[PDB]
């Protein structure tokens, strides 16, 4: 089957700059009789249907604005946007129509900028949690950027990876930031056999990891 790769996966852009997307195929998608390239670029909004923008990889569809243009033929396919807007926050795809079965791309998403970082969001477990027979300590990461972050759970100096439930959010529409929650659940007698719980997270904009912990007794 014809497989396609996309590069890069994600990139941070500002308002008004030029965005170039690359789609590469393993085989040639050029039909020699009519010099056409069977590939089309896609665009899907969060909560809406995916729509087409560029057909035959070099021509514009009616209804698409003049900022969306495409170039390339055969193997290298390029989609160049002249000036992005605030409504251009979407995920782009490229699909070939050369041979069956049809395959899709990996997906490219654009981001915004920049410079967000958290300090402390440590919440101890409440009294209503232990009556149900379990225990749960949470760690949020609000107002942080970029989304590439590593969370680590430490219990009395020992690393524990089982029971960690991570959850990432999308980009905010007010300050262009992200939020991440990490919930470690456990049973009730394991919570009483330990005292200290350390919430560890390493960041890119800091040269030292932020350490913070709390005690049970």
């Amino acid at each position: 089957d014809i497989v396609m790769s996309q590069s890069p996966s994600s990139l941070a852009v500002s308002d008004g700059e030029r965005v170039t997307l690359t789609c590469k195929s393993s085989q040639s998608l050029l039909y020699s009789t009519n010099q056409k390239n069977y590939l089309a670029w896609y665009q899907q909004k969060p909560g809406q249907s995916p729509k087409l923008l560029i057909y035959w990889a070099s021509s514009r569809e009616s209804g698409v604005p003049d900022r969306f243009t495409g170039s390339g033929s055969g193997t290298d396919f390029t989609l160049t946007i002249s000036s992005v807007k605030a409504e251009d926050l979407a995920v782009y795809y490229c699909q070939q129509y050369y041979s069956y079965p049809l395959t899709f791309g990996a997906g490219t998403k654009l981001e915004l900028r920049a410079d967000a970082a958290p300090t402390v969001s440590i919440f101890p477990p409440s009294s209503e949690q232990l009556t149900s027979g379990g225990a749960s300590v949470v760690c949020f990461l609000n107002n942080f950027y970029p989304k590439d972050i590593n969370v680590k759970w430490k219990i009395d100096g020992s690393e524990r990876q089982n029971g960690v439930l991570n959850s990432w959010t999308d980009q905010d529409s007010k300050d262009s930031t992200y939020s991440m929650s990490s919930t470690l659940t456990l049973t009730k007698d394991e919570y009483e056999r330990h005292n200290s719980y350390t919430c560890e997270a390493t960041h890119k904009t800091s040269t030292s990891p932020i350490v913070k912990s709390f005690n049970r007794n």
Partner: protein, 214 residues
């Protein structure tokens, strides 16, 4: 221009069969072909197959062998798609694709088909509060955990919509055939703990509403 109306969300158990429709209007059904695209993992798109309604030409993907058989309706002008032997990896949103020309293809609104061996439970909520007596930040953050509900979604507001600013809603995670979520809002230190706050969760599938004061 052309309308592609599909079915709504369905709650099905594992082992049954689900049928997905795609109503066509505004154009003739016996001229253009219909395709199906399965969207998994949020962003990844998978091709299911296609059907020619006039000559009964049917092709399917290698990943959908003995799973998806396509059937068209020549009298009601609509398409049908049925699945057999549903498993846990079939939780995805499915679209019907209208192959008009090689220039443009029209899409539908999508059918959310989730599958779990799962009963509708009322959500149990617990308030969260920081256990420290003092802090260095001028803001105090709070939250409440929503655990043990089915199905999606649950609308979580704060103080009956008055504290709408600075709210952060996290997506749910499936653990033991039931979803869990959380929320965090930022509160200035001039109100807490002299002024009380409340968590308002709502579940229209269970018709419950519990208020927890922090």
């Amino acid at each position: 221009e052309v309308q592609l109306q599909q079915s709504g969300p369905e709650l099905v158990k594992p082992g049954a069969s689900v049928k997905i429709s795609c109503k066509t209007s505004g154009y003739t059904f016996t001229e253009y072909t219909m395709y199906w695209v399965k969207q998994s993992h949020g962003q990844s798109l998978e091709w299911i197959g296609g059907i020619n309604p006039n000559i009964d030409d049917t092709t399917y993907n290698q990943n959908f062998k003995d799973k998806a058989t396509l059937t068209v309706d020549k009298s009601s002008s609509t398409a049908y798609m049925e699945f057999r032997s549903l498993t846990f990896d079939d939780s995805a949103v499915y679209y019907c694709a209208r192959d008009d020309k090689a220039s443009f293809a029209f899409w539908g609104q999508g059918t959310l088909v989730t599958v779990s061996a799962a009963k509708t439970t009322p959500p149990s909520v617990y308030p969260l509060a920081p256990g420290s007596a003092a802090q260095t930040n001028s803001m105090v953050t709070l939250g409440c955990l929503v655990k043990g509900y089915f199905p999606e979604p649950v609308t979580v507001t704060w103080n009956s919509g008055s504290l709408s600013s600075g709210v952060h809603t996290f997506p749910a995670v499936l653990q033991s055939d039931l979803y869990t979520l959380s929320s965090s809002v930022t509160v200035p230190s001039s109100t807490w703990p002299s002024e009380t706050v409340t968590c308002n969760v709502a579940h229209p599938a269970s018709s419950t509403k519990v208020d927890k004061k922090i």
